[PDB]
């Protein structure tokens, strides 16, 4: 029954400069709320703290070696991070976009199959998107590397095939009952 | 540096600190259990009582108003306490022999504003929320 919080609010609350920054992030990133950003500012701070500790340790130090390499390999699987980075010295010099860039929502834009970070989120939350055998409704997801290619509309949502739409199918029978017969 | 620096002298430093902590008022309050012993509310956060009478209290200078509190006997320890009645005409809503839920100012036990010797505010009557009453979400039930 163990549980933990996933976000952290900023010490302080009114620093125009920070607020604007967050708003630009929501906009580019079809985000919903500040928490939506706060959640990531939080995710990142822990990663950076994880990193900083490690970087203070001796290199070759079974603890530093075994966990450093792991943090890196984890950070790379998600594309968040790259090789020269792909050492700890580089994660220290990293940022939020790099995570934010891997969510669904922005990818469904990023290859035509949405044309909007907008469209993207309503598409995702509405069941028209599988990551290869599996519908994924979590506009919040995190697309892994060799998983980038398997993202596509789903086997039945209409695009993806399958009749029309509880509203399109309404319209077909909308030209049927009146204009066909009585 | 007013404080030995011998490897040994843990006991002197440890104890000298224990001796000075007292002057901290928050600390002393806590160790003497003042909240249990002096305070009208138990060492609790809210407290309910009966209304004895309605007071129009004479706000301190340079301000000038009639304040509008009730005097309340707390059921828990028969303690007599005066409590502010906030917002416009809300006295209206509390009558003598009423019941009421009182709460602290948010001042740490220290009276608020111009309102002199009053340290508490009404929150509920009609068991029923001055706010909901003032708005007219809910009524003076009966």
């Amino acid at each position: 029954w163990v549980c933990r919080k996933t976000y952290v609010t900023p010490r302080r609350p009114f620093e125009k400069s920070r607020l604007d920054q967050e708003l630009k992030l929501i906009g580019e990133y079809g985000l919903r709320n500040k928490r939506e950003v706060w959640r990531v500012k939080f995710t990142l701070a822990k990663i950076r703290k994880a990193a900083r500790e490690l970087l203070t340790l001796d290199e070759k130090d079974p603890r530093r070696l075994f966990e450093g390499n792991a943090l890196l390999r984890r950070l790379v699987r998600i594309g968040v991070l790259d090789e020269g980075k792909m050492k700890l010295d580089y994660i220290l010099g990293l940022k939020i976009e790099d995570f934010l860039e891997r969510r669904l929502q922005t990818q469904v834009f990023k290859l035509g199959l949405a044309k909007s970070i907008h469209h993207a989120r309503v598409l995702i939350r509405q069941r028209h998107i599988r990551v290869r055998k599996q519908v994924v409704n979590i506009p919040s997801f995190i697309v892994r590397l060799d998983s980038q290619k398997h993202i596509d509309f789903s086997l039945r949502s209409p695009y993806g095939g399958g009749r029309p739409g509880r509203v399109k199918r309404k319209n077909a029978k909308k030209g049927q009952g009146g204009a066909g017969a009585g | 540096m007013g404080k030995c620096r011998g490897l040994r002298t843990a006991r002197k430093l440890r104890s000298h600190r224990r001796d000075q902590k007292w002057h901290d008022k928050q600390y002393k309050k806590a160790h003497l259990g003042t909240a249990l012993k002096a305070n009208p509310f138990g060492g609790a956060s809210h407290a309910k009582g009966i209304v004895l009478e309605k007071v129009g209290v004479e706000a301190k200078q340079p301000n000038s108003a009639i304040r509008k509190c009730v005097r309340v006997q707390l059921i828990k320890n028969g303690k007599k306490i005066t409590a502010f009645v906030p917002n416009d005409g809300c006295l209206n809503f509390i009558e003598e022999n009423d019941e009421v839920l009182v709460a602290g100012f948010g001042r740490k036990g220290h009276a608020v504003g111009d309102i002199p010797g009053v340290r508490f505010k009404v929150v509920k009557v009609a068991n029923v929320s001055l706010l909901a009453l003032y708005k007219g979400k809910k009524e003076r039930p009966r």
């Binding site: - | 129009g56 009639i66 006295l91």
Partner: protein
């Protein structure tokens, strides 16, 4: 819409001893707009505010005059004895 009053004694510092014509002596507080140029006296008519508060006390709002006092019989306030 209330009665009036009649100063009996003086205290000082926003404090004055009055004697309500109705037979009620209380400590009334000068009025803010009146005090600006009004200095209640121990022998004069005045008007103090008093609402839902037992009326055991009242605050001074404005003052009155004397010469008019003879007219007060006409004010329909004071009896054939004031």
């Amino acid at each position: 819409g209330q009665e009036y009053a009649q100063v009996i004694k003086m205290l000082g510092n926003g404090r004055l001893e009055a004697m309500c014509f109705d037979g009620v002596k209380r400590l009334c507080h000068i009025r803010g707009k009146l005090r600006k140029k009004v200095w209640i006296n121990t022998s004069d008519i005045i008007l103090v505010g008093l609402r839902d508060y037992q009326d055991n006390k009242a605050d001074v709002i404005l003052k009155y005059n004397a010469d008019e006092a003879r007219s007060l019989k006409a004010y329909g306030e004071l009896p054939e004895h004031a």
